[PDB]
Design a protein around this nucleic acid. Sequence first.
RNA 1: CUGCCGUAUAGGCAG
Length: 157
Amino acid sequence: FTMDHYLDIRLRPDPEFPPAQLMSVLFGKLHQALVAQGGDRIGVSFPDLDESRSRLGERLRIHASADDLRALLARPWLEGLRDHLQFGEPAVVPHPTPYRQVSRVQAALDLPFVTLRAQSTGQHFRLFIRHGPLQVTAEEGGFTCYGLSKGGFVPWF
RNA sequence: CUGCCGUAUAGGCAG
């Protein structure tokens, strides 16, 4: 694939903040960073997904070419948040893996979500997220400024 | 929370 790289960002446990809240913040900053960067070739997955308990889990995985990932990481988007994260190393994904879409799903759902604050409005909203069915190969779409699918697939492992 | 395509809170999207 063109997206054979990734990086895992682990939430460090914090007594004052449930993971879902750090994740929402993590995910928001990445969103700020992608709007900055500008492409549509960076995707995300939540590898510790718990479907049964509708939680996204303690990990955010970012997927990209070695080059898009370099750029994104050479940028102060986790400035203020580094302290709450444990970062892996950017790496070539293992293989083979199945692939899946990770997508926003809109309207109280049985789906994990992140709470965000829209930039214009001060309004908080809930962006619900579905990890689609596993398949064997990747179809050829891309991704949104949220790293979520507008056609594209991410290796799931 | 708000907004958009759409005849339609069919169904979709964007923040």
